[PDB]
Symmetry: D2
Subunit: 462 residues, 4 copies
C-alpha cells in the first residue's frame, strides 16, 4: 500500500496512491497543529501550479530540456486545475516562509511528471523535485508569488463578483422603494422623513465604495516576488527570469501581474496583503451597518420597527404568522466580525518581518483568503436569500407616518410655531395624531391639514 522513501532523519512510508514524498510526510509529523480545518488554502495550492508552470516554461531559455519541461508543465496544470488537491495535507502552521508547501508542490509535480514520462514514483528520476521543478527558485520568493496570485484570483473571481451582485440587488430594491416615505431615525429617535429608496441608496453607495477600495488595493498585489531568490538580490537566478515569469503568469491568468520593482520590499514584508485586508475591513464595517439596519428594519411583527418584510429562510410556524428571523443578516454580521479579527491577525504578522524575510507568510495569506471568500460568499447568500425578497410593509409605514409627531413643522408657515408646538405637545400628552389634535383645538380644518402637511414636499432642500 506504501512505498519507502528517506530523509536525513530516517525512513518514511509514503502511500502509493499519493504523489507527495518523504519531505511532505515528515512535515505532517513535525507540524501537527490544528487538524484538517487548518490545511493550506486550495487557492494557494492552485496558484503554485500556475507558478511552477510559468517557471518551467521560462526555464527552457536557461537550459531546461523541453521534454522534461513539458511534463512539468502538464503536471503543474493539473495542480492549478484542482485535480490533485488530495495530495496536499500540510497545515498553515508550518515554517513562516511556506517552505514545506513549496516542497509539497515540488514533490507532487515531480512524481506526477515522472509518471507521465514512465518512471517510478519516489525515484526523483527523471524529474528531480529541487533541481527541476524548483529550478531557479527559492522557497523565499515562490511562496510570496503564490500568495499574490491566489489573492488576486480570489478578489477577481469571488470577492468582487459577490459584492457586485449585492450592489445590484440593493440598487434594484432602492429604485423599487423610491416612492415609499418613512420616518427617519437619528440617535434611534424619530426624525424627519426620507424614502426607503433614499435610505437604500446609502447602502448601494457603501457597496460601490467598498468595491473601489478593494480595487485600489490590487496594484501592489499584482507585484510578484519571483526572481528575488533567497534575500532579494536574485543571486542564483538568470537575468530576465523575474520579468519573464511575471509576464508568463499574466498571460496564463489574464490579470496584469508584473515583477516587483524592489524585491527586498517584496520578501521582507507583505504590506500589500495588510492593505488589501484593510480594504476588506472597511467593507466589513459597511456590511455590518447594512445588514444590521435591515435586521432592525424587519423587526416585529408588532413590537419592533416593522418597515420591511424579509423572506422566510427557516420553517415558519402556523401559530406565529409574520415572525421571520433575519437569518442572512446574522450570517453576514458574524462574517463581518470575523473579517475584523482576521485583519488584526494579518496586521500583527505584517508588522513582524525580520531583516530580509517576513516569516509570517502562511498565516497572513490564510486570513486574507478567508476574509475574501467569506465576504464574497456571504454577499451572494445575503443577496439571493434576503435582499431580492425584501418587501416594504407599506400599510405599517403609512400608519406610522400618520401617527408621527415629526411632520408638525409643516404647519408653522400657516398657524405659527407656537400653535404648532401646542398641537405636538397636546397630541404627545393625549396619544392622538397631529390631525385629530390640530382640529380638536380649532386651529385648522381637516381640509387645511391634508393640504398643508405633504411629506412628499419634505424630502429635499428648497
Amino acid at each position: 500500500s506504501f512505498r519507502i522513501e528517506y530523509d536525513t532523519f530516517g525512513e518514511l512510508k509514503v502511500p502509493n496512491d499519493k504523489y507527495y514524498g518523504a519531505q511532505t510526510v515528515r512535515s505532517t509529523m513535525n507540524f501537527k497543529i490544528g487538524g484538517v480545518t487548518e490545511r493550506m488554502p486550495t487557492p494557494v495550492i492552485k496558484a503554485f501550479g500556475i507558478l511552477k508552470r510559468a517557471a518551467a516554461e521560462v526555464n527552457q531559455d536557461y537550459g531546461l530540456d523541453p521534454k522534461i519541461a513539458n511534463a512539468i508543465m502538464k503536471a503543474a496544470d493539473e495542480v492549478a486545475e484542482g485535480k490533485l488537491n488530495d495530495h496536499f495535507p500540510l497545515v498553515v502552521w508550518q515554517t513562516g516562509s511556506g517552505t514545506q508547501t513549496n516542497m509539497n508542490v515540488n514533490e507532487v509535480i515531480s512524481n506526477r511528471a515522472i509518471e507521465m514520462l514512465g518512471g517510478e514514483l519516489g525515484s526523483k528520476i527523471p524529474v528531480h523535485p529541487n533541481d527541476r521543478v524548483n529550478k531557479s527558485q527559492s522557497s523565499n520568493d515562490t511562496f510570496p508569488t503564490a500568495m499574490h496570485i491566489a489573492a488576486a484570483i480570489e478578489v477577481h473571481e469571488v470577492l468582487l463578483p459577490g459584492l457586485q451582485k449585492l450592489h445590484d440587488a440593493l440598487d434594484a430594491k432602492s429604485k423599487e422603494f423610491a416612492q415609499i416615505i418613512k420616518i427617519g431615525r437619528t440617535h434611534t429617535q424619530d426624525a424627519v422623513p426620507l424614502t426607503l429608496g433614499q435610505e437604500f441608496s446609502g447602502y448601494v453607495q457603501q457597496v460601490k465604495y467598498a468595491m473601489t477600495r478593494i480595487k485600489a488595493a490590487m496594484p501592489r498585489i499584482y507585484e510578484l516576488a519571483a526572481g528575488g531568490t533567497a534575500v532579494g538580490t536574485g543571486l542564483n537566478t538568470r537575468i530576465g527570469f523575474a520579468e519573464k515569469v511575471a509576464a508568463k503568469v499574466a498571460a496564463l491568468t489574464g490579470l496584469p501581474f508584473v515583477t516587483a520593482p524592489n524585491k527586498f520590499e517584496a520578501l521582507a514584508a507583505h504590506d500589500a496583503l495588510v492593505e488589501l485586508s484593510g480594504a476588506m475591513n472597511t467593507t466589513a464595517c459597511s456590511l455590518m451597518k447594512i445588514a444590521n439596519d435591515i435586521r432592525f428594519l424587519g423587526s416585529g411583527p408588532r413590537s419592533g420597527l416593522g418597515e420591511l418584510i424579509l423572506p422566510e429562510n427557516e420553517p415558519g410556524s402556523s401559530i406565529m404568522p409574520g415572525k421571520v428571523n433575519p437569518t442572512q443578516c446574522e450570517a453576514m454580521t458574524m462574517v463581518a466580525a470575523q473579517v475584523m479579527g482576521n485583519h488584526v491577525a494579518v496586521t500583527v504578522g505584517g508588522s513582524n518581518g525580520h531583516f530580509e524575510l517576513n516569516v509570517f507568510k502562511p498565516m497572513m495569506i490564510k486570513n486574507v483568503l478567508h476574509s475574501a471568500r467569506l465576504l464574497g460568499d456571504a454577499s451572494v447568500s445575503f443577496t439571493e436569500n434576503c435582499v431580492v425578497g425584501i418587501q416594504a410593509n407599506t400599510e405599517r409605514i403609512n400608519k406610522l407616518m400618520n401617527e408621527s409627531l415629526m411632520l408638525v413643522t409643516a404647519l408653522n408657515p400657516h398657524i405659527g410655531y407656537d400653535k404648532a408646538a401646542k398641537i405636538a405637545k397636546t397630541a404627545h400628552k393625549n396619544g392622538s395624531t397631529l390631525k385629530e389634535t390640530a382640529i380638536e383645538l380649532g386651529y385648522l380644518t381637516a381640509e387645511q391639514f391634508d393640504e398643508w402637511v405633504k411629506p412628499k414636499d419634505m424630502l429635499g432642500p428648497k
Copy 2:
C-alpha cells in the same frame, strides 16, 4: 526666565519656575511626539512619587542620611499628592523603558528637596538626583513598579467604584421594574414575555461579573519589579531592599503589593497589564450591550420601541415633545469601542518584549490607565445622568402587550391549536388584536379571553 544647567552634551536653558533639570530639557528636545495630550499620565507621576518616598525611607537602612531622606520624602510626597504636576512635560512616546520620566522624577524631587533645604535650584547640592533620589534603583525596575502602583490605584479608586455605582443603580431599577411585563426579543423578532426587571437583572449580573473579572486580574498587578535592577538579577541593590520597598508601598497605599517572585518575568514582559486590559475588554463588551439595549429600548417616541423614557439632561425643542436623544448611551458605547482598540495596542506592545526588557512600557500603561479611567468615569456619568432616572413607559408597554400576537398560545388548551392559529393569522391580516379577533370569530367571550390569557403566568417554568 531661565537658569543654565549642563549635561555632557552642552548647555541647556531650564525655566527658573520649573523643578526639572538638564536631563528633562534634553528629553523634551528629543521626543517632540504628539503634543500636550500625550503627556505621561498623572497617575504614573503620582505613583513615582509614592515609590521614591518608599525608597528614600527604606534607604536609611542602607546609609542615607536622615535629614536628606526627610526632604526627599517630603518632596516625593508633593509629587504623589499631585502638587507638582506642572513639572512633568515629557510624553508617552519616549524611551520604551520610561527612563526619561524616571529622570524627570529624580530631578523634580531633587530640586524641590534642595529648595526645602535652602539650596539653589539646579545645584545638585545637597540632593543628587541619581545618587540619592535614585539610590538602590535602576532605570529598568522603577518604571514597571510605578506602572503597577498606578494601575492598582486607578482600578481601586476609579474603575471599580464607577462599576459599583452602575451595578447598584441597575439593580434598583431591576427591582423597581420587577412587575412590568413586556414582549421579549430574540433575533429582534417578537418573543415570549419577560419583565423589564428580569431583563435589567441580566445587565446587573454582567456588571457584577465585570467587577469579579477585573478583581481577578489584580494579584499579578500587585507584584512589583523594584529590586530587579538592570536585567532582573538585583545586581547593585541591597539584599532585602526588594521586599522592604514593596512592603513600604503596601503600607503607604493600603493595597497588597508584594515583590515579584520572578524579576526576569517582571522586567521582560507586562503580561499582567495585558490580562488587566483583557478584563476591561470584557467589561467593554458588557457595557456596550447594556448601553445599546437601553439606547434602543428608549427609541421613539412613536417610530421606535418606546419601552423606556430616558432623562432629558440637555434642553430640547418645544416643537418636539417626547424626542430625547440617549446621549449618555452614546458616550458609553464610544468609550466601549475605545477600550477595545486600546486593548489591541496593549496586546501588540505586550507581545514584543526582547530578551531581558520589554521596551513598550509607557504605551502599555497609558492604554491601561486610559481604559480604566474612561470606563470608571463613563459608568458614573451613565449612572447619574441616565440609569437612576429611567422610567418605564407603562402605558405604551401595556398597549403593546395587548397588541402582541405572541400571547396566542395560552388559548391552546382551551380552544385547541387550530383555532388559535386562525385567530393569530386573522389578527395578523386585519391588524387587530388577538382578543378582538377571537371575539369577532365567536371562538370565546371577552371574559373568557381575560381569564385564559394571563401574561403573569408566562414568566417562569412550571
Copy 3:
C-alpha cells in the same frame, strides 16, 4: 441512493447513508459560505451529544417513555463519541443562535435512534426530532450550553495539557542551564550578566501564569444556560430541569458544570467566552515573547547571537553546517498572531448582543476553540520539536563573556572608576579585551584581573 423528505419550501433529496434530514439539507443550500474548512467544530457537535444525552435522561422525570429515552441516549452517545461526525455538514456561518446545528443534531439523533428501534429513516417515527430529542429545550439555550461544554473540555484536554508540557520542558532546560553565565540584553544593547537558566526561568513563570489566567476564566464557562428556553424565563420547561441537566452534564464529563444563576445574562451575552479568549490572548503575548527570544538566541551561526543550538527540523545541507532554521518558533509565533486576531473577532461578536439573545454564537465559539486548539497543539509541537532539543553554545557564550565590555565594573573597588573607564574606552577603540587592555596600560596583572573579575559574583544583590 436517496430518500425524499419535505420542508415548507419544497421537496428535498436526503442521501440514504446520512442520518440528517430535510432541515439540514435545506441549510446546506441556504448557507453556502466558505466551504468545508468552515464546518461547525467537532467539539461543538460532541458537546451537543453530551447535552442531548443528559436532557433525554432527565426528561424521563417529565413524561419521556424510557424505551424512547434509552434509544435517544445511545444515539446521543455515538454523537458525543465522534462516531457520527460525517453527518454534520453545516458551516459556522448560519443563524447566530446556532439553530441549524441544533436541528442537525436533533435530526441525526432521531434517525439513529429510530434505526436502533427498527423504524424507517426520515419518518420521525417513533422518535420525533423536535418533540422528543428537543424536548423541554430551545435552540436559544442549547447552543450556548454546547459552547460552554465544548470550551471547558477543550481547555481541560488540549489547551492546559499542552501548556503544562511546555512549562515542564522549559523548566528542565532552565535547571540544565542554571550555571551558564551570558551577557544580558536591554534595549537589545549589551548589559550585565545573568544565567541562561535565569532567563529561561522567566519563560517558565510566564507559562505558569498563563495556565493560572486560563484557569481563572473557567468558573463562568462552567455556568450552563440550559433551562433558560427562549428568552431566559424558563417558560415551557419544567421546574428543576435546569439544575438536573447541569448536574447530569457534570457527572457525564467529570467537570464542575452548574446552572447559570441568571439565564438572561447567559442568553443575551457570552462574556465568559470573551474573557476566556482574553486569557488566551495574554497567553499568546507570553508565547510570542518566548518563541521570538528563542528564535533570536539561536540566530547565526556566525552573524547572529548564537547562544543556542536548536534541533534540526528541516533537512540540513552538507555545504551549510550550523545553519538551523527555527521552524517551530515560526509556527508558534504565527499561531500567537492568529489568537490575537481571533480575540478581536470574539470581542466584536460579544459586544453586539441584542435584547434577550446574542446572535453571534457560532462565530464566537469557533474562534475560542480555534485559539484553544492552536495554542495547545503548538505548545506540544514547540516542546517536542524544539525546546527539549535545545543546547547551549557554551564555547561561543564563554568567548563573548571574555570579549564583553560589560564586566569592567568589577574593577572599580580595586583601581577606581576613572581607570576602569579608560580600560573600557581603550578596548572599545582598539577592539581588544578588557584584560589585554587593563594589562597593556599597566593598571593590573593578569593574576589580578582573573581574581577581581568573577562574573559568578555578579548575579545577585549584596
Copy 4:
C-alpha cells in the same frame, strides 16, 4: 469671575473670561469623562472655524446681513487660526453626533463676534448662535464635515510631510551604503550577501508605498456632508448651499473638497475614516519593520549584530563606551503599536452606525487624528534624531564577512562541492575562517581564495 446665562433648565455660571455660553457649561456638567487629555482635538476645532467661516460667507446669498456676516467671519477665522483654543473645554466622550462641540463653536463665535460689534457677552445680540452662526446647517451634517476637513489638513500638513522626510533620509542612507556588503538574514539565520544599501532600499520602497496608500484614501475624505442636514435629504437648507460651501472650503484650504454625492452614506457611516485609518495601519506595519530592523542592526556593541552605529542623543555612561540605546526606534515602534489599536477603535465605531446617523463620530475622528499626528511626528523625530546620523560599522562588517561560512559556495567551480563542504564543516568545528581552513587543508592558496571568493560578484542575477 462669572456671568449668568440661562437655558430652559435653569441658570448657569459662565466664566467672564470665556467666550462659550450656557449650552457649553451644561455640556461640561453632563460629560465629565476622562479629564483634559480627552478634550476634543484642536484640529477639529480649527476645522469648525473654517466651516463656519465658509457658511457665513455663503449665507450672504441667503439673507445674512453683510455686517453680521463679517464679524462672524472674523471670529470664525480666529477659531480656525488656533487663537481661541482655551474656549473649548468639552471632551471627545460627548454625544455621538458631536452636537455639544457644534454648540460650543456656535457660542464662542457668536460671543466673540458680539464683542467685536461692541455688544455684551452672553447677550445673543446681535449674533444669535443658532440662527446666524448655525444658519443653513444642522447638528448632524456639521460635525462630519469638520471631521473630514481636519483629517485632510492633518494628512496634508503633518502625516505626509513626516513620511516624506523619512523616505528622503532613508534613500540618502541607501545611496551612502550602496557599496557596503554584509551577510543577509532569513529566519534570522545567516544567508547570502546583500548591501546595506539594498536592505535600506527595501525600507525606502515601504515608505513610498505608505505615502501612496494614504493618498489613495483621501478622495473619499474630500467628500463633505454639509447640506445633508438632519437625515441626508437636505430638508431646511437652500438649494445650492451644499455645493457652494464645499467650494468655499476648497478655496479657503487649497484642498479639493467637494460635496458628498450621497448624503445618506455620508451621515450614516464614516467608511472613509475607516479606510484612512487602514492606510495608516499598513503604514504602522511598515514603520514597525523598519524601526525594529534598525534597532537590531544597531545592537551591541559586542554581543549583538553591530552593523550600525546609531546617533547618541542622550548622554551615556563614561564606563560604557559603545553602548547606545536605540531610543528613537522605541518611540517609533510604540507609536506603531498605538496606531494598530486606534485602528480597531475606528473599526468598531465605523461598524456601528444606526439608520440615518452614525453616532460614534467624535471617537472615530479622535483616533484618526491621533494616529496621523503620532505617525507624522514620530517620522520626523526618527529621521532627525536617528536616521540622518546612522553610520555603518564597516570595520566590524568587514570582519564578519570574513568570518562568515556563507561565502563557501564560490569555491564549488574551483575545487568541487565535496572539498568546499569539508572546509565549511572544518571551519565550523574549529571556529576558524573559511580561508584559514582551506589553506590549512592545502586545498588552495591564499591568493587563490582572494581571487575566487569575491562578495562583489554575489549581489545579483547573472
